[PDB]
Amino acid sequence: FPIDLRGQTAFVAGVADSHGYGWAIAKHLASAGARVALGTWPPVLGLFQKSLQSGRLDEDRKLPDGSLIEFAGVYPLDAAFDKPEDVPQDIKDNKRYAGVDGYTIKEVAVKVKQDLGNIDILVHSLANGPEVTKPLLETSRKGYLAASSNSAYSFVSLLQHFGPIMNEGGSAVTLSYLAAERVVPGYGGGMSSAKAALESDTRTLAWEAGQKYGVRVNAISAGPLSFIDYAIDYSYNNAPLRRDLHSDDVGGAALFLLSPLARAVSGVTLYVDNGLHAMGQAVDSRSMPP
Amino acid sequence: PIDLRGQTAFVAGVADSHGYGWAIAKHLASAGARVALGTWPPVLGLFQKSLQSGRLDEDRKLPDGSLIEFAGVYPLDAAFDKPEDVPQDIKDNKRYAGVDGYTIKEVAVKVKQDLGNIDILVHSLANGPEVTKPLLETSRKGYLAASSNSAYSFVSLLQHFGPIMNEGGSAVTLSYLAAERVVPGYGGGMSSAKAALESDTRTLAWEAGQKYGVRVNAISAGPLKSFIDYAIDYSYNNAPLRRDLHSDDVGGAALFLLSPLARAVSGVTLYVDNGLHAMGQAVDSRSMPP
């Protein structure tokens, strides 16, 4: 009863599998009684769809009841394209792309509207850095510009196209990382920069949609779920909280941002990171004793 | 859903039933918490009184329709830590007759005995005797007063309650935008008390995070003629979301922050303010056109 989402429909761009935030969020959204549709990268839309209807994901659709997560559709979606005129020929001709169509952001919005009416909850859980391995001084223009297109501008496009089919009081959420605000070596070919752009756009768009649509626009900067393994232990050892960052922690937090408990919350960047954002110094440094 | 059953919450600074403290307790109870109240002793007898008669039965409504009940109402003056710290003219001060043991430490002992370990701790306390006076006209006495009532008290609440707090518990306080950015009129050092308060929220987060495994967060609220009046009007006219800020808004966002959903959330300042913090200018300005 504190979060009754019955009545509400959500669309979640960026669920290819059951291990990302996208999946975790949907799980929670649905868990509060919302209809939940998914945007899925065409290249993997098939495998995901087979992976669902197989039975294979039932341990992961599993809810509080023992009932399973059901979806109001699972749409092809490529956040790199806003409308079909934008799609390059070789992609139209690409082997992993034929069969599936109407996968631009605009096309997907029209589809959601004709299939489910207006929506209440918008999630943006997609980021892509073709040069994330590379440091900024070794990042190309094409690289940088791609990282931003996929990660940053895709939120704006999404909001552009979903906004007009979003109920008053409705809300949207995206995902960021520390590196947006504070240097974090590793991350990665303009990914940091795109994230910064996302957080600014999160703010600007909270103003724009607040006014035109009455829609809340927020961001979660998350901890880490190789570069990673070390990052996981880093946070384990330097966070205010001696604990791992589970995906449910972020899902959990997104549920709130997208519930009417956050009806006055907009333009925010919520750190869901066991509190690492709050330190000005690692305690496990080689320069301190243990 | 989100389930505070089995859990006990201590809410410091609830005298009226129109403040944030009320709003917050109200919400915690709706989610199934045991709620205890700490009240500034001059208003206790009265407050306790007005509750018990049937006065507040309307303000205790429950959103099912039942009424919120309290596992206790406690005298609490947050200006004092030990009994030792109370000056005589207060011990003697007529306004305090009957009541005993309202120094943070004493409240803790009583709470520990009557109820045992708690999980949720709310700090709804702000007081500054020179608040109407601009900072260049605030005295040392009032500025320390303000810091002593609205910052330190939080530190002491933790110092004394931390010990009785279950691992995974969380505390919250309430801040205001002036602590990061100039709000003319919010004077007396309240501005400064609050920047200290947000800072302690981060420091304590680390410390309590590490020592008791507890989370520490802040809600930076908007405004709930007058100086308030103009404030409300401004925010209504300039915030991304064109609405009034109800106390339920804060109520709900505390309810998220103090709940398991927020277990990876620590050391944050959460703006519950209709988006206003996100703004770099007023659309309202007599410099702009309508």
Place this chain on the structure above:
Amino acid sequence: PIDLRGQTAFVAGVADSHGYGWAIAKHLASAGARVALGTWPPVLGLFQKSLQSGRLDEDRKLPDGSLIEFAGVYPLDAAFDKPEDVPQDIKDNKRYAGVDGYTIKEVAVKVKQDLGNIDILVHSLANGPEVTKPLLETSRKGYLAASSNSAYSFVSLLQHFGPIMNEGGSAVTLSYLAAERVVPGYGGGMSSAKAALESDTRTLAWEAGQKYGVRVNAISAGPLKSFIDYAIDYSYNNAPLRRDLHSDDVGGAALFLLSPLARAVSGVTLYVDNGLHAMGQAVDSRSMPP
């Protein structure tokens, strides 16, 4: 005093003589620097021309009374990194006739040869073809355009100049408040380009700091009818210091940031804005009284 003698500064993006680039070069020269200029090639012939005739002799005055001289004026289009990246219709585009080698890398080689290692690098470059359009009406094309002109270019400037930069050198770029907080009207993704830009300033600071031993900082400037007009008026009416923002103000603060006085200063955003960033509200509001 502070002494840039023996030192050489490269200032990218000086076409007019009323921008920040002019103001900055002007200041560096006053402190005894060799100053070279990079100019967007369509305006070079002209700019170079107007200099040489005696036109700008008044805007080159020197505060002793002598005139600023340039160790070079260079074609520089910051949209291109290698010659390879130039499209034909540009190579052919009539507006570019005569000039060759204005891709960041080429400019660097020429600068390295003609002058050798530099110590000071200025990035006065911002361009967004959809800036008048709100973010919900900005396209992917223009948004990437904006990022490509006003963010990445900085990254490339460093990538290519870093190599020829003396240890202890410093670079600066220019940001704007909208990158942290919503300024309605500053659209086209310029807002986003700038948040990326401030972010790169921190990342690069680390990297260039470590690799070339160079510092990287930003000046977030105020405004130097119109949308500007209202902006200027607003800031004049709402900033702590009731003054107009001269370009010398920015000029001087770059001059500090690029000088030995600032050798422990890296990765900052410096607001040179009459204090306006510090504000949480307008005293101007039609919600307030006079």
Place this chain on the structure above:
Amino acid sequence: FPIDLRGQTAFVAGVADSHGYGWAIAKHLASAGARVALGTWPPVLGLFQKSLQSGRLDEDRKLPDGSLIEFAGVYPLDAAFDKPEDVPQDIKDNKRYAGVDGYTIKEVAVKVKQDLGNIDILVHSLANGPEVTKPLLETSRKGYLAASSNSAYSFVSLLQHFGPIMNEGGSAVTLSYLAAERVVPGYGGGMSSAKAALESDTRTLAWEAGQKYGVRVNAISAGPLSFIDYAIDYSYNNAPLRRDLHSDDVGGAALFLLSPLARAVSGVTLYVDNGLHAMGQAVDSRSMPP
């Protein structure tokens, strides 16, 4: 000529010896041709005065020319007291306090005005935490409240009393530390919190003095010049800059904030810390390899 301070008088509260920032700043201020008066803790005013006239400090008064720093007076000053009615009897009777008088902030302002006329530059270089060894959960009220009184409120008092004798265009500066904004274990009995308050007051006071006096109010958050030794190596190994933080680095930076090159700079917090503020992660962590 870029910083000609000839004509200008400065007062610098907090110079007991030649190793603090207070001394470094004066050195630079004087170095730009300013008259510089010093506030000195009465308890040490004698030893400092003897230490000067002895010859002993001549290597440290040493300027660019070979000439020495001269002062327009060296005043007893205790930033814990604003006016004499504030001073406790035992202090008046204290052994290290007799002889010297008129040492409250108000009294010192009157003295400066009657001796030197109006002033142009105000420096606030004093901080005191009687419990800085202790973590926040072990800090007493008296401790906390003292740390703030000495460190935070002393700036406000200073500005209150100097403001009215400060020329239009004049400016003031104070010193802070990371821990204000980000947790730094070690620091220290409410010192962190006071610093947060200082930075807020730095902002508020830039608004107040901007309007009433036309005076710029800024802060330098500095790096570190035991708890320390480790902190020095910490920054050495984790900063964007592989270098030590000399006192001249801060002095340098204060000179700018207090020169007319910063005529548009107010409410700022300038990181002068080899860039440490900019990282979100230590590179020498035990969790990374080296």
